[PDB]
Design a binder for this molecule. Structure first.
Ligand code: K2U
Ligand code: NI
Ligand code: NI
Ligand code: NI
Length: 160
């Protein structure tokens, strides 16, 4: 079922989310399936549960069309594997119509759980890594405008 995505300005995007504790449940399977459908209708590559006003450590991401594997990730934890940063374009479904250039870690490891309870641990780079970092920020109440360094790159998609 498609859910409403809340927009920047909503206090619900500024929370730090608690852990998922119903791995393998029907309830969690239903929420994940709704998040994939939601992400798909909005033409996203990532979506975090706080963006649909669900206060949990849970994100979906991915796309066929470099491809990033379709993933649902609960209780994520991330770590940089070097200090190397890379600039790239980002937008956000809770900030419709805008983009900016944002520095992120080029290389990371992330760990958490698939909805069925299986552990997930992967090394990621480039675009894969960026998506994960961007969604992770939602879980700790951060949006990308707080990370812009060059405000000349912040603007409307149709205009830039
Ligand atoms: O709003 C979110 O939290 C989901 C974003 C994820 C994103 C993260 C990093 C870089 C780009 C996007 C939305 O998917 S934005 C739509 C989009 C689609 C393809 C390429 C770029 C942006
Ligand atoms: Ni469509
Ligand atoms: Ni976002
Ligand atoms: Ni490589």
């Amino acid at each position: 079922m498609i859910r409403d995505i809340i927009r920047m300005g909503d206090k619900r995007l500024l929370r730090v989310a608690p852990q998922v504790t119903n791995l393998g449940s029907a309830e969690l399977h239903a929420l994940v399936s709704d998040m994939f459908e939601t992400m798909g209708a909005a033409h996203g590559v990532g979506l975090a549960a706080p963006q649909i006003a669900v206060d949990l450590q849970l994100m979906v991401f991915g796309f066929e069309a470099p491809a990033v594997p379709l993933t649902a990730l609960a209780n994520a934890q991330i770590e940089p594997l070097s200090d190397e940063m890379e600039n790239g374009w980002e937008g956000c479904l809770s900030i419709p119509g805008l983009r900016a250039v944002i520095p992120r870690y080029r290389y990371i490891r992330y760990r958490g759980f698939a909805p069925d309870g299986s552990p997930i641990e992967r090394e990621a780079e480039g675009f894969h890594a960026r998506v994960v970092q961007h969604e992770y920020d939602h879980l700790v109440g951060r949006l990308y405008p707080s990370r812009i360094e060059n405000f000349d790159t912040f603007g409307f998609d149709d205009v830039l």
